[PDB]
Ligand binder design. Structure first.
Ligand SMILES: CCCCCCCCCCCCCCCCCC(=O)OC[C@H](COP(=O)([O-])OCC(O)COP(=O)([O-])OC[C@@H](COC(=O)CCCCCCCCCCCCCCCCC)OC(=O)CCCCCCCCCCCCCCCCC)OC(=O)CCCCCCCCCCCCCCCCC
Ligand SMILES: CCCCCCCCCCCCCCCCCC(=O)OC[C@H](COP(=O)([O-])OCC(O)COP(=O)([O-])OC[C@@H](COC(=O)CCCCCCCCCCCCCCCCC)OC(=O)CCCCCCCCCCCCCCCCC)OC(=O)CCCCCCCCCCCCCCCCC
Ligand SMILES: CCCCCCCCCCCCCCCCCC(=O)OC[C@H](COP(=O)([O-])OCC(O)COP(=O)([O-])OC[C@@H](COC(=O)CCCCCCCCCCCCCCCCC)OC(=O)CCCCCCCCCCCCCCCCC)OC(=O)CCCCCCCCCCCCCCCCC
Ligand SMILES: CCCCCCCCCCCCCCCCCC(=O)OC[C@H](COP(=O)([O-])OCC[N+](C)(C)C)OC(=O)CCCCCCCCCCCCCCCCC
Ligand SMILES: CCCCCCCCCCCCCCCCCC(=O)OC[C@H](COP(=O)([O-])OCC[N+](C)(C)C)OC(=O)CCCCCCCCCCCCCCCCC
Ligand SMILES: CCCCCCCCCCCCCCCCCC(=O)OC[C@H](COP(=O)(O)OCCN)OC(=O)CCCCCCCCCCCCCCCCC
Ligand SMILES: CCCCCCCCCCCCCCCCCC(=O)OC[C@H](COP(=O)(O)OCCN)OC(=O)CCCCCCCCCCCCCCCCC
Ligand SMILES: CCCCCCCCCCCCCCCCCC(=O)OC[C@H](COP(=O)(O)OCCN)OC(=O)CCCCCCCCCCCCCCCCC
Ligand SMILES: Nc1ncnc2c1ncn2[C@@H]1O[C@H](COP(=O)(O)O)[C@@H](O)[C@H]1O
Lengths: 98, 55, 120, 347, 167, 110, 320, 61, 49
């Protein structure tokens, strides 16, 4: 298939591996998650425009709306954690081991 | 020597102490999220390359 | 397993061809066991809230028994329907494939040589 | 939380799972998962302590990563088929990605590491919702896409889930983590019989939902979180110890309890297909779950741990709680094995 | 070169994702993701999807990344960053040189090495963009889609007001 | 291609003006100095209010994103369905704003 | 359930009845501060309901036939044996103190339940914010150990966080000399067997922690002995208050509805009173708990749920 | 003489975070009983004269 | 009078007990009606009369 499809998939897997290796910040996890969403938007948009499948042109907008509401929910979770501890560190979240 | 010690040991006790040991090692986890998501990454890489599960 | 059959008639609990089957009798052992489960539900219901277990809520224990028999009768109808559909599909497939199910010649035991193994 | 808002949010959770179940379009499957997560997050944060915020953070990240992998699997299906029907996938790689995403949504191993933490952080009723209702949607999607699932992948996930969920719960004293490793083990048991006969998958789903529903209703009825708090029930209410006795013995699959029914039908279906070894290792693993259920019953019911003086005051207050359907869910979860051929209603 | 402009913007898109995915900070992570959103929007715009690229700029970089930078800037105020950056860039440029010399590459699927202009259509669509009519069909056809999306956004407002309340 | 040339010209003129503005008054020599704020050295207090108005913007922006193809949606054959879903979306935006009002969401950013 | 969330759905809001007269006031003092009649006079001059001081048999005073039950079913403890033998062998001191704190938590739950279900204010007597003043006195006397105090503070940590403090706290300045004078002027010989440093420890924990830790999260009042003899001046001081402290200000229907759903569930209030911490002073063993529970099944009106007992003549049980 | 019911020490076996403490999972304290942790401030400004008045605020946001 | 408070179940809730007995009798008569319709439909489809 197309080579730009390989580059968008490699962008998705790069932001995947950035999401699967936490450094410190929870905001970095959310930014890797929304980079995953962005690569999904680009890939779905290129496939839908390329095949001229007209009724799926409304699909990437719905993807964008749902995952942006997902990101707003994530930011509210991060702000509750930032009120609890002070940072958005992931090593603060070690209460539920016991 | 046999029927309070060795026959008592061979079938139930080695199983008992081995399940105790492996029960400790499975829940020997330090409860940190970086550990578990790095294990998810090692899961994805071993599943793709090491196991031929995409075939 | 049989989801290709009940995909043209969706969400029907008991289809129109189920009424060709004989319904489970009201004296069925399965239905009477479900009524026993209703009695046990009444007993544990009085037990968890500290009532006289064998006396309190005869209306309530009778409602448990009535409700379990009422649900279990339709469940037994669906059970008998699905097993009847299973045997009907199997037998129509056996008739529509004669070549896959051969009539094996049943050997009489005068030809059947099993090796004798002595016990001593 | 406002009760009208609580009813609207719970109906949004149920609406998300219904939209996963009824829809024929992949985007509507993904939308149902998004609605499910988006409405279940405040159910976990009903009490607004730091443990619920941590649990909802871990739950949100795991279900969000799973939903992004689900949309990637859908998008590669749109590459290799140009269409959106919810049926078998026309790509091995989309099959592997969607099976991994549904494994992260079920909490199956080796994506299981969020289940005991999120079960421990949240309250008991939201834990009940998590461990019963949230398994209904990805098992429906796995019920629909089984002509494309890699056999070795789903069996590896299944046996690794059973071994980790068995060899984990032997150490625990928290009741919610015991239910969480029970969840991991039972989802291994459900997905292992999936490609052989999925009616047994739905049977194990019903019997698991009934047993976990009974157990969390008992845990809400006594307000117990640990093993010792469960074992101090005998002087507060003696019958609740008997009920957790019989139901914990059911969840490991004792004969002739009804929790023996699903895995007996699973070994009955896996040996039809000339797998003798794999259900043998699975039944060897399930005896560990049976062992720590025995340990919990020796803690709670068959012995009587010594109480305090304050229990005499709680003698004088019977339980003012909504124990909704608890005798019904106890009778169904233990005395159902004589009705084993009722499983054909799920065909 | 200019025939390969979607490929060039795709390479810049991957370089931006390796740039912020090595995670120096949430601030520079947001900065790199903004630059990546712009170049991925350019990738969308080079296939004729002008409305979806303007949805990227108006919604993604317009609302959501602005709220990410807004929350980052008021709630926060390496070796491994540079090493992971050069690791990912070496992986990407090995892939680039492979497909430059071979005109074919298989990472997971098999892929072409031509310019990605070769996957188009040669006709005209009359007096409408096709994608404009497809999004205009959201209201006349997508009744169920608009219902579930609007209900999810209403419950999104309700959920955020519940969990940011603190009590 | 005219668009990318124009964007390159505007970005290049802006970058050139910024380089000149940062490096022309460095050619002056004048001197060096010591150079030692209502809040002195305290940590920045996190305002819940600002975050709430940012998320309220983001949710109403998503509802706007659903509302955007209406000038193209008026051209449809199926006008009753189109008009019903359009008034439905603007009413759901109004219900979002009304729930934001009445359950005390717009406080100290009213 | 007569009250549930369906009651809140159908319109039973808690700020309808919550007028300005629905104020929670607690009058406090030492063992002989003489506040028991001041509480009744303030209750009959402000239109508030008075609750007598909870002792061993407060749960007996709420449940059943109302009479104080035998000391094996309720309490397993006494104030008089605490007065005779404060450094007792079996540890009756902390057992009595834990039973008293459980009874005060039940009393304060009844106070908030009355204040939220009827809207009628409650004059309290040594509420749950003023119960550790006796425990710390017992510990400073050496009547108990450290782990008893840690057990009580764990139970306090998992109970008092859910409840709101009262509006007004009235404190009665009576010195220890007048307290011992009224001890001799009572006539109870167990109560006459109390030394000086215990009353001094109660006074010290009072004036050093309780009024300083409540002077910010409620309105505290401090009065002497003689000026509290006229309760109408106290009622005058109550009627001219500018409420700006406590968490009473930021209460909607929903927070107080959570509080009302919490306080009417008696077992959920009494839940973490008995956390499973094996402290041997309060630990009643399994055979003894068996014996007293089976005898509790044998009491008239205690065998079943209260509307199902056939030894007291409940009718229509077969239709219940 | 009679039937053995457990002592305190047998029930102490089921009163921790895990049944068997190992050397790695030994640092655990048991979680709170009501499942609530302790959560673990007001702004001050110093307006200079930049008549002239030096206001010093104590702000609550 | 024995109890110091009036208990929540001192008198039977006649609404609830009437609902119990009426719903149970309704389920029995509807069950027997459906069963008689089923056996008559069986004997009408198979012609066993
Ligand atoms: C063949 C290639 C293809 C197969 C697949 C690839 C290989 C996998 C084989 C099967 C799995 C084996 C076990 C691997 C993980 C072990 C558990 C672990 O993580 O331990 C770390 C850690 C142990 O540390 P610890 O708890 O602190 O205590 C250790 C002490 O400090 C001190 O302890 P220590 O110093 O002694 O060292 C401890 C460690 C080190 O152990 C060793 O060094 C020895 C290990 C075994 C050696 C012998 C192997 C012999 C194999 C056969 C011979 C080869 C020829 C074969 C010829 C053909 C076949 C006949 O041992 C353990 O951790 C034992 C616990 C687990 C039981 C292992 C059972 C082995 C079965 C092997 C089957 C093959 O435990 C955990 O973290 C527990 C939780 C882990 C959860 C996730 C685990 C996932 C594993 C999945 C593997 C397969 C992935 C498939 C996924 C695909 C779909 C998604
Ligand atoms: C029937 C079987 C199921 C019964 C479950 C409930 C048992 C119960 O409530 O027993 C007490 C109750 C009498 O109690 P009560 O004197 O009124 O008051 C209780 C005291 O207040 C109790 O005083 P307390 O609680 O203050 O202190 C004593 C303490 C003493 O407690 C202790 O010391 C602790 C417990 C001792 C150790 C554990 C013993 C084993 C208990 C469970 C059994 C497990 C093995 C089962 C088989 C393997 C499966 C695991 O606790 C008790 O004694 C509690 C009472 C209940 C004890 C037994 C609970 C069993 C529940 C689970 C069994 C059912 C599910 C599994 C069945 C599997 C298949 C058979 O006995 C019964 O109700 C037994 C049934 C007798 C009537 C049968 C009449 C048949 C009529 C047929 C015609 C009408 C229906 C027609 C239907 C069809 C229409 C078409
Ligand atoms: C079709 C699927 C049906 C699924 C279940 C639908 C009903 C329950 C749904 C909601 C719920 O949980 O309500 C609480 C639930 C009572 O359970 P609970 O919360 O444990 O109450 C404990 C005490 O018994 C509470 O006692 P109480 O003093 O508060 O009042 C006594 C109450 C008073 O009763 C009434 O007021 C009922 C009359 C009015 C009903 C509404 C009419 C409109 O009677 C009862 O509670 C007796 C038990 C009622 C039946 C419960 C079990 C239902 C069947 C569950 C599935 C069984 C499947 C067996 C299959 C076996 C083979 C696999 O149900 C009701 O209150 C109404 C039940 C109506 C049964 C209709 C049966 C035919 C349906 C077609
Ligand atoms: C388009 C919008 C407007 C653009 C900008 C304005 C256009 C004109 C730009 C040039 C203005 C003049 C030079 C910069 C200002 C110099 C001011 C000053 O104090 O200079 C003294 C300075 C330094 O003189 P100095 O030695 O007295 O230094 C002062 C500091 N002490 C004494 C303590 C050491 O002069 C310079 O730096 C000269 C720089 C080059 C000036 C131009 C040379 C000819 C170019 C043809
Ligand atoms: C509150 C919701 C109010 C609006 C409800 C939908 C009204 C509408 O336009 O329906 C006709 C529309 C569109 O009908 P139509 O007649 O415009 O469609 C023409 C047919 N096609 C698309 C093939 C050209 O919807 C339907 O007919 C059915 C789909 C959605 C039905 C409503 C689901 C609501 C679920 C609630 C839970
Ligand atoms: C095997 C599959 C992946 C192969 C590529 C790996 C990229 C290079 C990184 C190697 C590991 C370096 C490292 O220390 O990673 C850990 C780090 C998070 O941990 P941190 O706290 O920063 O460091 C302490 C050590 N854990 O982790 C990170 O910061 C990782 C950031 C990942 C971003 C991916 C960029 C592209 C990488 C290549 C494609 C995949
Ligand atoms: C209590 C049961 C109440 C049932 C009410 C009616 C529900 C209904 O109509 O269910 C239809 C469904 C069979 O429909 P079908 O299209 O065959 O579904 C295939 C599933 N994979 O039937 C079923 O799914 C019934 C089996 C599930 C029963 C669950 C409760 C026991
Ligand atoms: C092929 C299969 C097809 C599908 C078949 C059907 C599957 C059905 C699965 C049902 C699972 C139900 C899980 C829970 C659903 C939501 C109800 C719930 O959790 O309500 C919580 C609610 C909270 O009330 P609140 O005021 O917050 O009080 C908490 C403390 N103050 O209230 C409470 O906490 C009340 C406490 C008791 C609640 C008990 C509810 C039991 C309901 C489930 C019954 C068993 C499952 C159904 C039968 C088998 C079906 C397979
Ligand atoms: N630790 C304690 N020592 C003595 N009395 C206590 C203690 N805790 C509560 N009290 C009660 O407080 C009362 C003192 O108030 P008064 O009714 O004025 O005597 C005693 O009679 C006891 O009922």
């Amino acid at each position: 298939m197309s080579l730009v499809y390989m580059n968008i998939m490699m962008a998705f897997t790069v932001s995947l591996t950035g999401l699967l290796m936490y450094r410190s910040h929870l905001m970095s996890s959310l930014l890797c998650l929304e980079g995953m969403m962005l690569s999904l938007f680009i890939l779905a948009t290129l496939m839908i425009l390329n095949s001229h499948f007209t009724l799926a042109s409304m699909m990437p907008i719905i993807l964008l709306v749902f995952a942006a509401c997902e990101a707003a929910l994530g930011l509210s979770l991060l702000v509750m954690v930032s009120n609890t501890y002070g940072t958005d560190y992931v090593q603060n979240l070690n209460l539920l081991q016991c | 020597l046999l029927d309070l010690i060795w026959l008592e040991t061979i079938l139930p006790k080695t199983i008992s102490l081995a399940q105790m040991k492996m029960s400790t090692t499975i829940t020997s986890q330090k409860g940190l999220i970086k550990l578990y998501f790095l294990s998810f990454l090692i899961t994805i890489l071993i599943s793709t390359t090491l196991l031929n599960f995409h075939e | 397993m049989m989801t290709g059959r009940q995909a043209r008639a969706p969400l029907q609990f008991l289809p129109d061809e189920a009424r060709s089957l004989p319904p489970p009798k009201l004296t069925d052992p399965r239905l009477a066991y479900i009524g026993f489960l209703g009695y046990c539900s009444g007993l544990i219901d009085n037990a968890i809230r500290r009532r006289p277990v064998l006396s309190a809520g005869l209306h309530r224990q009778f409602l448990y028994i009535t409700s379990f028999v009422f649900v279990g009768y339709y469940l037994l109808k669906r059970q008998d329907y699905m097993y009847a559909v299973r045997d009907h599909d199997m037998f129509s497939y056996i008739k529509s494939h004669p070549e896959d199910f051969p009539e094996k010649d049943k050997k009489t035991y005068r030809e059947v040589f099993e090796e004798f193994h002595p016990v001593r | 939380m406002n009760p009208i808002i609580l009813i609207i949010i719970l109906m949004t959770v149920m609406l998300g799972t219904i939209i996963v179940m009824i829809s024929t379009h992949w985007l509507l499957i993904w939308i149902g998962f998004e609605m499910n997560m988006l409405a279940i997050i405040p159910i976990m944060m009903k009490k607004h302590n730091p443990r619920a915020t941590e649990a909802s953070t871990k739950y949100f990240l795991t279900q969000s990563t799973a939903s992004m992998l689900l949309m990637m699997a859908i998008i590669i299906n749109l590459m290799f088929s140009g269409q959106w029907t919810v049926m078998k996938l026309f790509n091995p790689m989309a099959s592997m990605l969607m099976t991994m995403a549904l494994a992260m949504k079920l909490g199956m191993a080796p994506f299981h590491f969020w289940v005991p933490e999120v079960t421990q952080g949240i309250p008991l009723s939201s834990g009940l919702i998590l461990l019963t209702w949230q398994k209904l949607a990805p098992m429906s999607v796995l019920y629909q896409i089984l002509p494309s699932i890699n056999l070795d992948l789903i069996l590896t996930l299944s046996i690794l889930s059973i071994t980790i969920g068995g060899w984990g719960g032997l150490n625990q004293t928290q009741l919610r983590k015991i239910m969480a490793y029970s969840s991991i083990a039972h989802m291994g048991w459900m997905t292992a019989v999936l490609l052989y006969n999925p009616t047994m998958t739905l049977l194990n789903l019903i019997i698991y939902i009934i047993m976990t529903s009974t157990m969390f209703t008992l845990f809400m009825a006594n307000s117990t979180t640990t093993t010792l708090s469960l074992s101090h029930t005998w002087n507060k209410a003696p019958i609740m110890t008997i009920l957790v006795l019989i139901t914990l013995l059911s969840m490991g699959g004792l004969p002739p309890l009804s929790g023996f029914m699903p895995k007996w039908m699973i070994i009955q279906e896996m040996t039809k297909n000339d797998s003798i070894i794999l259900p043998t290792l699975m039944a060897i693993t399930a005896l560990l779950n049976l062992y720590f259920y025995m340990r919990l019953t020796y803690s709670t019911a068959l012995t009587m741990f010594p109480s305090t003086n304050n229990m005499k005051m709680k003698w004088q207050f019977p339980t003012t709680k909504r124990m909704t359907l608890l005798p019904t869910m106890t009778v169904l979860s233990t005395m159902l094995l004589p009705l084993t051929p009722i499983l054909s209603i799920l065909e | 070169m200019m025939t390969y402009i979607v490929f060039i913007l795709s390479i810049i898109f991957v370089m931006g994702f390796v740039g912020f995915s090595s995670k120096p900070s949430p601030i520079y992570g947001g900065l790199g993701l903004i630059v990546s959103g712009g170049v991925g929007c350019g990738i969308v715009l080079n296939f004729g999807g002008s409305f979806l690229g303007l949805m990227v700029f108006l919604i993604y970089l317009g609302g959501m990344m602005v709220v990410f930078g807004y929350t980052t800037a008021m709630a926060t105020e390496n070796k491994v960053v540079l090493g992971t950056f050069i690791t990912g860039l070496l992986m990407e440029f090995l892939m680039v040189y492979y497909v430059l010399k071979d005109k074919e590459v298989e990472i997971v699927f098999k892929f072409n090495g031509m310019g990605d202009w070769v996957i188009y259509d040669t006709g005209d669509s009359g007096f409408f963009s096709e994608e404009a009519m497809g999004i205009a069909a959201l209201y006349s056809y997508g009744t169920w889609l608009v219902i579930v999306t609007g209900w999810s956004l209403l419950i999104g407002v309700v959920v955020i007001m519940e969990i940011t309340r603190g009590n | 291609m005219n668009l990318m040339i124009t964007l390159l010209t505007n970005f290049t003129l802006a970058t050139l003006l910024v380089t000149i503005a940062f490096w022309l008054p460095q050619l002056n020599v004048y001197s060096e100095k010591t150079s030692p704020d209502p809040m002195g050295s305290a940590r920045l207090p996190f305002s819940m209010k600002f975050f709430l108005v940012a998320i309220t913007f983001l949710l109403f922006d998503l509802e706007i994103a659903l509302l955007l193809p209406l000038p193209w949606a008026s051209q449809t054959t199926n006008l009753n369905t189109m008009l019903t879903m359009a008034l439905l979306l603007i009413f759901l935006l109004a219900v979002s704003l009304a729930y934001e009002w009445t359950q005390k969401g717009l406080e100290w950013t009213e | 359930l007569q009250y549930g969330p369906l009651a809140y759905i159908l319109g039973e809001k808690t700020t309808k009845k919550m007028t300005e007269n629905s104020k929670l006031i607690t009058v406090d003092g030492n063992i002989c501060s003489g506040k028991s009649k001041l509480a009744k006079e303030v209750a009959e001059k402000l239109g508030l309901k008075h609750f007598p001081e909870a002792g061993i048999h407060y749960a007996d005073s709420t449940t059943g036939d109302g009479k104080p039950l035998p000391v094996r079913f309720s309490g397993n403890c006494s104030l008089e044996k605490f007065y005779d033998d404060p450094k007792s062998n079996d540890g009756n001191s902390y057992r009595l103190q834990a039973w008293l704190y459980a009874s005060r938590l039940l009393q304060y739950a009844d106070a908030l339940e009355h204040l939220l279900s009827t809207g009628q204010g409650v004059v309290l007597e040594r509420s749950i914010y003023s119960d550790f003043v006796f425990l710390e006195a017992m510990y400073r006397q050496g009547f108990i150990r450290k782990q008893c105090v840690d057990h009580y503070n764990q139970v306090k940590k998992v109970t008092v966080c859910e409840y709101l403090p009262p509006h007004v706290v009235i404190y009665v300045d009576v010195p220890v000399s007048e307290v011992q004078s009224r001890i001799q002027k009572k006539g109870n010989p167990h109560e006459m067997k109390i030394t000086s440093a215990y009353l001094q420890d109660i006074e010290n924990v009072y004036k050093g922690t309780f009024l300083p830790e409540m002077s910010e999260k409620c309105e505290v009042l401090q009065y002497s002995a003689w000026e509290a003899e006229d309760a109408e001046k106290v009622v005058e001081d109550i009627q001219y208050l500018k409420y700006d402290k406590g968490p009473w200000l930021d209460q909607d229907d929903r927070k107080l509805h959570n509080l009302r759903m919490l306080v009417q569930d008696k077992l959920e209030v009494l839940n973490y009173t008995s956390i499973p911490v094996f402290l041997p002073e309060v630990t009643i063993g399994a055979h003894q708990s068996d014996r007293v529970f089976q005898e509790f099944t044998e009491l008239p009106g205690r065998k079943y749920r209260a509307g199902y007992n056939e030894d007291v003549g409940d009718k229509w049980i077969w239709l219940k | 003489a009679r039937q053995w019911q457990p002592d305190v020490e047998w029930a102490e076996q089921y009163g921790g975070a895990v049944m068997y403490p190992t050397k790695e999972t030994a640092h655990w304290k048991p979680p709170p009983w009501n499942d609530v942790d302790p959560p673990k401030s007001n702004l001050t400004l110093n307006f200079g004269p930049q008549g002239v008045l030096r206001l010093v605020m104590e702000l609550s946001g | 009078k024995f109890y110091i408070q009036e208990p929540p179940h001192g008198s039977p809730n006649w609404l609830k007990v009437g609902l119990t007995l009426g719903t149970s009798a309704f389920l029995w008569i509807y069950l027997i009606k459906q069963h008689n319709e089923d056996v008559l439909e069986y004997k009408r489809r198979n012609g066993l009369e």
